[PDB]
Amino acid sequence: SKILVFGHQNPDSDAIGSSYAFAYLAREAYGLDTEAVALGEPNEETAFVLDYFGVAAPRVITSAKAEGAEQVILTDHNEFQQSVADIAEVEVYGVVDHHRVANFETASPLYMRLEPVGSASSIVYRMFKEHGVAVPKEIAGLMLSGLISDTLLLKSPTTHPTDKVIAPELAELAGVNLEEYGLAMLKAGTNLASKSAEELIDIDAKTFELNGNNVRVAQVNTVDIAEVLERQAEIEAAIEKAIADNGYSDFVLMITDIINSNSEILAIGSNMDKVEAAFNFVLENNHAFLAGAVSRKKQVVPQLTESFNA
Amino acid sequence: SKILVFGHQNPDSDAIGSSYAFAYLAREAYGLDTEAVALGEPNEETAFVLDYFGVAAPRVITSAKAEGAEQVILTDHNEFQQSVADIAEVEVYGVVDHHRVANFETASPLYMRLEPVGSASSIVYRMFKEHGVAVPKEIAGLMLSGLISDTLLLKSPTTHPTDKVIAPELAELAGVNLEEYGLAMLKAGTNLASKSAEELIDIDAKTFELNGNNVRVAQVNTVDIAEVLERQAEIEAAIEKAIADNGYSDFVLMITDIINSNSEILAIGSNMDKVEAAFNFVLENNHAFLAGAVSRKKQVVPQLTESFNA
Ligand SMILES: [Cl-]
Ligand SMILES: [Zn+2]
Ligand SMILES: [Zn+2]
Ligand SMILES: [Zn+2]
Ligand SMILES: [Zn+2]
């Protein structure tokens, strides 16, 4: 029977790109009856990627059991709360990911291929080369885009030396110029004007427990920090509501400039002294500039973590 | 800094073979400073393997922090309670394994290579091949012996079709005949007569919670079932004591004939009706014959699980 292959809830480009590519690879090289599906519709950055290479969005599902599947393959995630609603009721045949492992468990052995690299799509690509399988131009496009999206065009410190090697091979296969296409697709996910502030602060947001404090950390990509900060009133009203509704001790929003690879940090809550101490900066009107920062998990969360435990 | 590579507590041949082999591969292919260590002394089967190929036992450690390690690599296990005592206090850099995932979590991304095949050694071998790293004769021997040990010379239902393809490749590299070396090494772990009955039932034993009931399932390998049962009285006595002292509802001993691939089941406790039902047999004198049974996790435990649940 069919094995469904999917990325996380609130799919990003790497989630869609990795699962679409892996379902193809599995059919071609592993003898598997796989289908790529998605857990949500594409965001604007991914809608652009899909358009550019002329691939339809993988269909959305909400229950793996409803779709007839007894087995699934997860890509770009493993944590059960990031997965399909009924993940505990199906077998995990396999996982291809680049994140920490938590909230994840199986009854039986499985395939796992995890590497601490820039994207799941990087791993999937290298698996096409291992098995001598040709990469269709549109699948190369999708994988390249996964890698560019997760690392902001190889600028993030989550970029591994192997990523820097495969990026030009992927550009060639995809038929694009690396820097030009990369800039183009990243730009497509920076038009936030038509979204409400509530939506904005929940586009890419997670909660971290830091020495007993529930700290919410969101990120948005932009070509212009000032354009985001010019909506500051409604953003602060959304964040105060979020703090009120959810019991967050603190809310930190990363406003990430994709052109210059820096973030502005807009933060509100009980422990602002610890935010200032984490980054050696001074909040003015709830915000300060953080040079070089584009990775939540490498450049903001560990810094807060240390500071909150100090 | 030195990265420690090791298998699980109470190491079997696969644990030591896969950790020794991977520490070498990681130095040659990944530019890592790895050292293989063990969490216990070799059993009698593994000592035979190590003597055959001219390889010293990996030194035993008890604390990764005492050894000055900050990073470790786990082979043949991932469950924290099967690992080094201070596993929570160091970084898991990588895992290579063929078991289910449980009791396992990391703070950061990592390497994982998991496959539902017959041994971790099988996976390590494939990685040598994938990286173009020539396999030293003694390392092929350690890897082969891990596979043969975990699958009873490829007769276990845990054996994967890829195990059957690699075994002859590994035997040629190791310089041995598959069947004859495999039989010799398996016989080296059947020295039951010089163990007491208390030791015997605890050589390879695990507790499985089956619907509130704590069921102890032990296994021993022998060349002669009837010979093991010459000591039936002292085994039953050791068993009755273990049930009493540990509050097991039931105790199942598999006495596995390595020559013919069958087991005798000797069982004692509150739920024998469910044991008989699990296997379509009648227990006479607390035992019965179970044709084909060599794997506890595939041929004994699921059958008891389903039976213990109606
Ligand atoms: Cl297992
Ligand atoms: Zn993702
Ligand atoms: Zn990703
Ligand atoms: Zn083992
Ligand atoms: Zn093993």
UniProtKB/Swiss-Prot annotation, chains A, B:
Annotated Gene Ontology cellular component terms:
cytoplasm
Concerning SMART domains, the annotation shows: DHHA2
Extract the coiled-coil ranges from the record. Answer: none
Q: Give compartment(s).
A: Cytoplasm
Q: Where is the signal peptide?
A: none
Enzyme nomenclature, EC number: 3.6.1.1
Hey, which family's this protein in?
A: Belongs to the PPase class C family.
Can you say what this protein is called? Probable manganese-dependent inorganic pyrophosphatase
Record the organism: Streptococcus gordonii (strain Challis / ATCC 35105 / BCRC 15272 / CH1 / DL1 / V288)
Q: What is the lineage of its organism?
A: Bacteria, Bacillati, Bacillota, Bacilli, Lactobacillales
Q: Which gene encodes it?
A: ppaC
